[PDB]
Design an enzyme around this catalytic site. Structure first.
Site, short mmCIF file in Angstrom:
data_model
loop_
_atom_site.label_atom_id
_atom_site.label_comp_id
_atom_site.label_asym_id
_atom_site.label_seq_id
_atom_site.Cartn_x
_atom_site.Cartn_y
_atom_site.Cartn_z
N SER B 5 0.86 -1.17 0.00
CA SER B 5 0.00 0.00 0.00
C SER B 5 0.90 1.22 0.00
CB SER B 5 -0.90 -0.01 1.23
OG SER B 5 -0.17 -0.27 2.41
N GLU B 7 1.29 5.49 0.78
CA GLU B 7 0.74 6.66 1.45
C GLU B 7 1.24 7.93 0.79
OE1 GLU B 7 1.58 8.73 5.74
OE2 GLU B 7 0.48 6.83 5.78
N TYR B 39 -3.75 13.62 6.44
CA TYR B 39 -4.56 14.78 6.78
C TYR B 39 -3.74 15.80 7.56
CZ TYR B 39 -7.56 17.72 9.62
OH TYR B 39 -8.11 18.81 10.25
N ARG B 97 -5.98 9.82 15.78
CA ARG B 97 -6.39 10.83 16.74
C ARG B 97 -5.86 12.19 16.31
NH1 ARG B 97 -2.39 12.55 20.83
NH2 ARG B 97 -3.15 11.66 22.80
N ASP B 99 -2.25 14.89 16.43
CA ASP B 99 -1.51 15.48 17.54
C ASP B 99 -2.32 16.51 18.31
OD1 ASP B 99 1.05 14.14 17.40
OD2 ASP B 99 1.42 15.25 15.54
N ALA B 106 -8.07 7.95 19.54
CA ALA B 106 -8.31 7.18 18.33
C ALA B 106 -9.33 6.06 18.51
CB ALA B 106 -6.99 6.61 17.81
N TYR B 126 2.93 1.84 17.28
CA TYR B 126 4.28 2.38 17.46
C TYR B 126 5.25 1.38 18.08
CZ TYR B 126 1.28 6.42 16.86
OH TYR B 126 0.34 7.30 16.38
N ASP B 139 0.65 1.87 26.03
CA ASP B 139 0.54 2.15 24.60
C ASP B 139 0.08 0.89 23.86
OD1 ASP B 139 0.83 4.17 22.60
OD2 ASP B 139 2.61 3.13 21.86
N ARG B 145 -7.17 -1.83 22.51
CA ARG B 145 -8.47 -1.17 22.57
C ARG B 145 -8.95 -0.77 21.19
NH1 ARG B 145 -6.41 1.17 26.97
NH2 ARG B 145 -6.08 3.28 26.14
N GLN B 157 4.45 3.04 12.72
CA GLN B 157 5.18 4.25 12.44
C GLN B 157 6.45 3.69 11.80
OE1 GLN B 157 5.88 7.03 11.48
NE2 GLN B 157 5.47 8.32 13.28
N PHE B 197 12.00 13.93 11.28
CA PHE B 197 10.81 13.12 11.52
C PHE B 197 11.07 12.16 12.68
CE2 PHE B 197 9.07 15.20 8.22
CZ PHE B 197 8.78 14.57 7.01
N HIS B 247 3.62 -1.07 3.93
CA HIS B 247 2.97 0.22 3.70
C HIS B 247 4.11 1.21 3.49
CE1 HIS B 247 -0.35 3.05 3.93
NE2 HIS B 247 0.39 3.83 4.71
#
Ligand SMILES: Cc1cc2nc3c(=O)[nH]c(=O)nc-3n(C[C@H](O)[C@H](O)[C@H](O)COP(=O)(O)OP(=O)(O)OC[C@H]3O[C@@H](n4cnc5c(N)ncnc54)[C@H](O)[C@@H]3O)c2cc1C
Ligand SMILES: Cc1cc2nc3c(=O)[nH]c(=O)nc-3n(C[C@H](O)[C@H](O)[C@H](O)COP(=O)(O)OP(=O)(O)OC[C@H]3O[C@@H](n4cnc5c(N)ncnc54)[C@H](O)[C@@H]3O)c2cc1C
Ligand SMILES: NC(=O)C1=CN([C@@H]2O[C@H](COP(=O)(O)OP(=O)(O)OC[C@H]3O[C@@H](n4cnc5c(N)ncnc54)[C@H](O)[C@@H]3O)[C@@H](O)[C@H]2O)C=CC1
Ligand SMILES: NC(=O)C1=CN([C@@H]2O[C@H](COP(=O)(O)OP(=O)(O)OC[C@H]3O[C@@H](n4cnc5c(N)ncnc54)[C@H](O)[C@@H]3O)[C@@H](O)[C@H]2O)C=CC1
Lengths: 281, 268
Positions: B5, B7, B39, B97, B99, B106, B126, B139, B145, B157, B197, B247
């Site tokens: 995939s 991005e 986004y 979610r 930043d 999320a 992550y 985390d 969840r 990530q 990054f 990805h």
């Protein structure tokens, strides 16, 4: 797991070898104004890497001029190639002394090809005519005209015993082949380093042609690696650089501290590979 | 048997707009399982994200998953947006979610999306722990969840320490998270940008890698080759460890990701 930790150690050991790896670049006399421009640009670029030496192929010549143009333009040790084709022992000795008195003390002794004298004889000749640093050819995957592997192997020792300073292998893509060959050599009594000749492949078609004519093998994984890239020059270059960098990584780990690059007058690929070896400006 | 995939991100300039579509056409021939678009709150807003998704869908017929964040957005707004996408054929959403400039996490967005429709949902994971997490344990419990709330898969990530990913995947399985933990691969051609990054996300850059890019600040071509070598190595290792999905953070560039996919057997 293991594969993950192995790559980490392998990449780290390569990162630490930065500074003690010798490299040499092989070029060829240009046949066009465009190629001449490309060559002298690659020489200027690759010279910043301060290679042990650079060599120039010998056809059947501008070889002498280019050698000269290099030694004085960059001041790098330029080793001209020399064959036994269309030349008599008398002429050869002439050329020999013609080089020594020109600052050229390093020569790559080769027999050559035709469309009666062997390389070994030329080695002894250069040694008989003077005392040059003779570099000869080695074939990990046996030379085509060789009777047998051992026969070809015995010939190298013959060329070394003749006074060969070092051996430079025909390009190869099967690392195992090189490694086992180098073992066969020392196991045969040859006391010189078998410097691997690296061919960075950007043009697979040409590379496959060269291989067929030199009895060099193109492992299946490699053939599959380039399959379908006939019209993708950019992707071929990335794939080719990846293959070369991996090969030189494995060799470096195995103790190889010398590399000879068949640049084909192009600098970027060899330049990048050297960079990963720690050889930088 | 490898799925991939890509991005991309909304272009903010005419030149990047050009670059993006050239990459979309180039990569689309590889028939990726899906493509996603990021986004940016203060860098494009969701209309630009929506625009690109529609463009990809109409132009390639590829599954395009928009990234949707729930920050500074009310639940009712989110439902409206979700319904709009669903009725227009968009059935895959990367639920994030975003930043914090608490409100909703999320997992709350995942739950909210599943209520609207049977969306296909991807959530962020992550390997080196989210920087704001109370702990690695917490985390991981959060990922659980998000999956339990309906997340179909997790996308990590980026990372350069392959073992961090491998150990993380093992912890996920031990935690009962059965969905696929798809590694996010970042091909590096611009190390300075990658380091920025990484520093912002606590992603470790192995010493050998930092050394590999040292001295190439003004050599774009060598960075590309070195970067491609690193990336191809990573996917090869991961592939040998059973990873069947990748990805790619193309950053709107196609060459590197295209080449990597080629060496992975993913060809047109
Ligand atoms: C680093 C490198 C650079 C090259 N540069 C050039 C170049 O610039 N110009 C050019 O024209 N070519 C060049 N070549 C190609 C080379 O000249 C050919 O491969 C050629 O076939 C001769 O090989 P050789 O120099 O190894 O000679 P040799 O060492 O003589 O080997 C050739 C064959 O002769 C056999 N042999 C040797 N002695 C005997 C004997 N006494 N009896 C029977 N068989 C024997 C060997 O087993 C072998 O099969 C290069 C090759 C390499 C690897
Ligand atoms: C594949 C991928 C794509 C991304 N795309 C974008 C994008 O397009 N746009 C964008 O804005 N950002 C994007 N991001 C970045 C991301 O939005 C940030 O990392 C953000 O800070 C958290 O998002 P999340 O979805 O992981 O949220 P969450 O999963 O909610 O995690 C955030 C933190 O909150 C913690 N947490 C969860 N529940 C609680 C609780 N109840 N109490 C306390 N702490 C809790 C978690 O442990 C973690 O520290 C992406 C990240 C990845 C890996
Ligand atoms: N490693 C080898 O087997 C080499 C063989 N040669 C032979 O010597 C001849 C004369 O030298 P040039 O003027 O440079 O020839 P050329 O100008 O036709 O070829 C230019 C360069 O391409 C590469 N090349 C060409 N044919 C090759 C082959 N069969 N195998 C590997 N590399 C090849 C070499 O780097 C050569 O220097 C070549 O045509 C070739 O037949 C030259 C160099 C290397
Ligand atoms: N995978 C990730 O970690 C992503 C994180 N983000 C975060 O959301 C913010 C807003 O989105 P945009 O408006 O697109 O930001 P932006 O316009 O500043 O960045 C454009 C694009 O560059 C890439 N990018 C930027 N920072 C990144 C990072 N730290 N890690 C991976 N990729 C990154 C993303 O594709 C992003 O869409 C970004 O600045 C970034 O902080 C956005 C997309 C992906």
């Amino acid at each position: 797991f293991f594969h993950a930790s192995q790559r980490d150690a392998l990449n780290q050991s390569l990162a630490e070898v930065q500074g003690q790896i010798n490299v040499s670049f092989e070029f060829f006399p240009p046949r066009t104004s465009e190629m001449e421009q490309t060559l002298w640009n690659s020489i200027d670029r690759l010279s910043s890497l301060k290679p042990k030496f650079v060599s120039v192929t010998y056809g059947a010549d501008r070889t002498h001029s280019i050698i000269k143009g290099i030694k004085d333009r960059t001041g790098l040790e330029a080793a001209p190639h020399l064959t036994c084709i269309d030349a008599t022992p008398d002429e050869l000795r002439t050329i020999a002394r013609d080089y020594w008195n020109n600052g050229i003390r390093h020569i790559v002794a080769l027999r050559g090809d035709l469309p009666e004298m062997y390389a070994s004889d030329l080695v002894t000749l250069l040694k008989e005519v003077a005392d040059f640093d003779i570099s000869v050819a080695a074939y990990p995957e046996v030379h085509p005209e060789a009777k047998s592997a051992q026969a070809d192997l015995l010939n190298l020792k013959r060329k070394v015993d003749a006074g060969a300073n070092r051996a430079i292998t025909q390009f190869f893509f099967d690392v195992e082949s090189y490694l086992r060959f180098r073992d066969r050599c020392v196991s045969a009594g040859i006391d010189v380093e078998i410097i691997p000749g690296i061919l960075p492949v950007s043009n697979f078609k040409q590379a496959k042609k060269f291989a067929d004519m030199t009895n060099v093998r193109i492992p299946a994984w490699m053939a599959q690696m380039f399959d379908g890239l006939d019209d993708d020059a950019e992707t071929r270059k990335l794939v080719g650089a990846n293959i070369a960098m991996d090969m030189v990584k494995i060799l470096s780990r195995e103790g190889v501290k010398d590399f000879h690059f068949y640049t084909l007058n192009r600098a970027e690929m060899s330049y990048a590979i050297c960079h990963t070896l720690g050889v930088r400006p």
